[PDB]
Amino acid sequence: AMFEQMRANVGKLLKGIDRYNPENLATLERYVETQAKENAYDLEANLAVLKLYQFNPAFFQTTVTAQILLKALTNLPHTDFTLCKCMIDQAHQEERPIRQILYLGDLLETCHFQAFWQALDENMDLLEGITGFEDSVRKFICHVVGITYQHIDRWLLAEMLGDLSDSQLKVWMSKYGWSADESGQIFICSQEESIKPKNIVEKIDFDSVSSIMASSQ
Amino acid sequence: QWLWDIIDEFIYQFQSFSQYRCKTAKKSEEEIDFLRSNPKIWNVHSVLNVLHSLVDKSNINRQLEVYTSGGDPESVAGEYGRHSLYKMLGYFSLVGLLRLHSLLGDYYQAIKVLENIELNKKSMYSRVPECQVTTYYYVGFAYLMMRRYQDAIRVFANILLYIQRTKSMFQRTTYKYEMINKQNEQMHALLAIALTMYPMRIDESIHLQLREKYGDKMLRMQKGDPQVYEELFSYSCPKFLSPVVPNYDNVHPNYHKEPFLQQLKVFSDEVQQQAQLSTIRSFLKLYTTMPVAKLAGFLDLTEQEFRIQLLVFKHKMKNLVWTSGISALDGEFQSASEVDFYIDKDMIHIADTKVARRYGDFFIRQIHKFEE
Amino acid sequence: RLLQQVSQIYQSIEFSRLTSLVPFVDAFQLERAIVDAARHCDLQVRIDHTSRTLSFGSDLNYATREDAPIGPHLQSMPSEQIRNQLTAMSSVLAKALEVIKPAHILQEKEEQHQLAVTAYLKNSRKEHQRILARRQTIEERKER
Amino acid sequence: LQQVGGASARIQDALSTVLQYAEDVLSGKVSADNTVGRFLMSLVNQVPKIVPDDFETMLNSNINDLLMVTYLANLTQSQIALNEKLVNL
């Protein structure tokens, strides 16, 4: 609906010469408003609001810059998170809850979930101010569990997935290629994929050496 | 001071480069016949961008320490160059990948490089040897932060082809072979320091006396030491922005360290994050097939507070990469091969000497007709 | 000569069988007599003491030497048979070229026979009349 | 190596005769079957059997030996030549 027409704003204006004129920010922090309400995506333009900040520190806005890293946490496990974390200067990290939200990215790659789901300070309404933060950050988390398991019980599964019941655990596992082979195991994949031989039997082909074999003959 | 005419001599030409080459120089004939009859040097079109890249880094550090917002060589390099470089009708010269490594390069002084597959596609002209050393070092350090680490063996092997067949003959690098070849093997060895020990790309390239100088560093990573985040960060420290010269050093207010807190303090805290995976990889696989007794036998052998240690053993095992499915009935973990590769540099060293045997015969057969 | 003849048939014998096989020497006189005919003189005999077993052949890297005795003979070990295997395709297929007696390539033979024997009778007395002129060409080149 | 490739062409013509009769001796051409029958079975039986994991330790290491003498003779001859660029001064 509203996604398509404003994608024409960022996809036809800001692919060019206008990028060193800050009069794109009058619709780009409105695009920061766009991703909180309709779960939209333009990353390189959400980088472009932060591009104006460290070349021009006169235009720093607090409420804009907090949610864009929290929505870059919805663009985890994708590794653009490392670039946009250092894109804000250290001169804008002394404020609160910017300290709290930059600490939250630290605890997800090292998979701390008791702080994230059970010790979370939910006093800020911008977590519900963005749409679908639970469905996005667990979509990061059901992705990362599929590498590491072939058998886990569903009691210890929902404990590390932040205390939701079996009434929803079968619904989220019907989405992502998970079968409950009962008491308690969970089927992701076979054994033989990830022994991963880059094996001893690697070879030299006829065409790989025939470049040199034509001149010595 | 004594450097203000160094910018002003060359930027008066760089004023013209947006003016002439973008607006009017598609049918400009009269400046061309001045450049064919009058001067003595033919390679000025590769001098005029690349020596201007040097002299603008000489004055970005000058201007940004005297004007923060809207600097004047931030203006003339950044806000003039990019649409003026590529867009016009065909500039049938060697400037093709040269101009985009300015365009990606001025996209690289500020850290926002996200564009590696798009400039990979658009090229129809051949590559310059000056271009080839900068572009794997630019996108490889981009992939060092953007964490394509299993392709980071591929990008930093590509730069190290090492066949120079030297062409000096009047400083044609310029000043940048020995410094940057020191740079690209170092982050390659720092890839073997960070991503222990999957390359096996510097082992077949270079000798073992240099690899033990980092070999003192990489054994500090494994269990115990706080400088391993710091040796990774401080040896990258001339490589993050590479600033060359201050012209005015006044520290009362400093007014040059506010751009240093822009890059450097927030870039250092992620180097603490780099060796965290090396503490995930702080057990190299020596025991990789276990029962369920020896997973909990691995829980107390790694550290104390063994039950529940699985809340922090998952913190000890899950950073990007670690793959094994665990059993619960019989308890079998899985085992992923660290397997040898075999000697492909017997092929390549024929091609090393066959190009040298022909070229030592190519250059010196002219010598037999130069002096005799 | 037992080891040049047991190694062409067997691939694994125990040593305990072989010290009963030869009655007139003890084990350590035997064992040193085994190993100098195998490092020299192109035997394949390997010795494995964990199950007391000898192994003949079973090493497919071995480049054979020229100065071996070709004595009483059998099918050899496969290190003489994985090498010289492109010959066995090359030898027996041209012997198999006979046993078909294939009727189309026979007519290409005889037309190539008939054209070649009549190429002589067409080109006769044209080389001999130039070689006589080449004969005079010697007696002007040698005087030159 | 054109004569190595001609030896494959020597094979490729000689393969053509037995295979063209093979679709003959399959379907009807079975009267003198056994004399070509005794010879085609023995041609396939005179060539011995390895699983190909045994073969690449023989083959590709010998390829690592033959590529080694290609470098090493050119290691030598470039130093024969660069000695010759030294003594011709």
Provide a short characterization of the protein structure:
Chain B has 372 residues and is mainly alpha-helical. Helix content of chain B is 55%, strand content 0%. Chain B is built from 18 helices and no strands.
How would you portray this structure in words?
- This is part of a larger assembly, with chains A (217 residues), B (372 residues), C (144 residues) and D (89 residues).
- Chain A is mainly alpha-helical.
- Helices cover 53% and strands 2% of the residues of chain A.
- Chain A has 12 helices and 2 strands; from the N terminus they run αααααααααααββα.
- Chain A has a two-stranded antiparallel sheet.
- With 372 residues, chain B is mostly helical.
- Chain B has 18 helices and no strands.
- Chain B has helices at 4-24, 30-37, 44-64, 72-86, 96-103, 106-109, 116-121, 129-145, 152-158, 177-194, 208-211, 215-218, 227-234, 258-274, 276-280, 292-302, 310-317, 345-367.
- In chain B, helix 9 runs antiparallel to helix 10.
- The N and C termini of chain B lie far apart (53 Å).
- A 3-stranded antiparallel sheet of chain C has the order 1-3-2.
- In chain C, a hairpin with a 4-residue loop joins strand 2 and strand 3.
- Chain D has helices spanning 2-27, 33-45, 52-87.
- Classes of the chains: A mainly alpha (217), B mainly alpha (372), C mainly alpha (144), D mainly alpha (89).
- The A-D interface holds A 201, 203-204, 209, 212-213, 216-217 and D 1, 53, 56, 60, 63-64, 67, 70.
- Chain A: It is found in: Nucleus; Cytoplasm.
- Chain A: The modification N-acetylalanine is found at residue 1.
- Chain A: Residues 41-203 form the PCI domain.
- Chain A: Belongs to the eIF-3 subunit K family.
- Chain A: The modification Phosphoserine is found at residue 216.
